[PDB]
Amino acid sequence: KLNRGNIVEFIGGIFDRRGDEEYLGEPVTMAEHMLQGATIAEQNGQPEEIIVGALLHDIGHFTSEFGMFSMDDTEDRYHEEAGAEVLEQFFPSVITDCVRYHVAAKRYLCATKPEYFNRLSEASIHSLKLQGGPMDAEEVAEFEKNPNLKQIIAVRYLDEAGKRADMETPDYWHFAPMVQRMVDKHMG
Ligand SMILES: [Fe+2]
Ligand SMILES: [Fe+3]
Numbered sequence: 452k453l454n455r456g457n458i459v460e461f462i463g464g465i466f467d468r469r470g471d472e473e474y475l476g477e478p479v480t481m482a483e484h485m486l487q488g489a490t491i492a493e494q495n496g497q498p499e500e501i502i503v504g505a506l507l508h509d510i511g512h513f514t515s516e517f518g519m520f521s522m523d524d525t526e527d528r529y530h531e532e533a534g535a536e537v538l539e540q541f542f543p544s545v546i547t548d549c550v551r552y553h554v555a556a557k558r559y560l561c562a563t564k565p566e567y568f569n570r571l572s573e574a575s576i577h578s579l580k581l582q583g584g585p586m587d588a589e590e591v592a593e594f595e596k597n598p599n600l601k602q603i604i605a606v607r608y609l610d611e612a613g614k615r616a617d618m619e620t621p622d623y624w625h626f627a628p629m630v631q632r633m634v635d636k637h638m639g
Contacts, residue, residue, distance in 0.1 A: 466623040476574025487613030504549030505609040549606040556607035561585035
């Protein structure tokens with residue numbers, strides 16, 4: 452049974468057990484990827500919501516970890532969705548949104564920033580094709596109504612930036628107090 456009192460430890464266990472696995476097509480592990488995002492954010496003075504959003508944005512890849520959430524086949528195929536479904540019970544909606552919309556953010560930036568498409572890694576370019584390509588104009592206008600647009604975009608940049616072959620970072624457990632602060636802001 453998961454609650455405000457053990458969710459941080461649960462997620463930490465996933466980092467401990469699964470974090471050494473490969474972030475597919477990139478020169479980082481799953482943990483390195485998310486920790487780099489969090490650390491780049493922290494080093495640059497980003498707020499804790501963005502740091503933690505970056506830290507957790509790819510936890511939904513590990514779908515066999517979430518049996519207690521009873522997710523359907525659609526909420527499973529898409530890691531951005533599975534991750535948000537896990538987090539929405541414990542975290543501020545800003546953080547949940549950063550995770551849920553991190554693929555849409557890529558599609559949005561491809562549609563709205565002219566030189567953005569060319570600066571992506573081929574793993575991200577390959578995934579874009581299967582994720583529905585750039586947004587159309589309707590999708591862009593819909594996306595810009597999101598009140599958390601700024602944080603969502605910040606987390607996408609941190610996603611793209613967290614693929615360094617070498618970077619010193621703290622481990623999950625050094626960020627865990629911050630994760631708990633976000634949980635406690637929400638669950639009060
Ligand atoms: Fe992702
Ligand atoms: Fe990512």
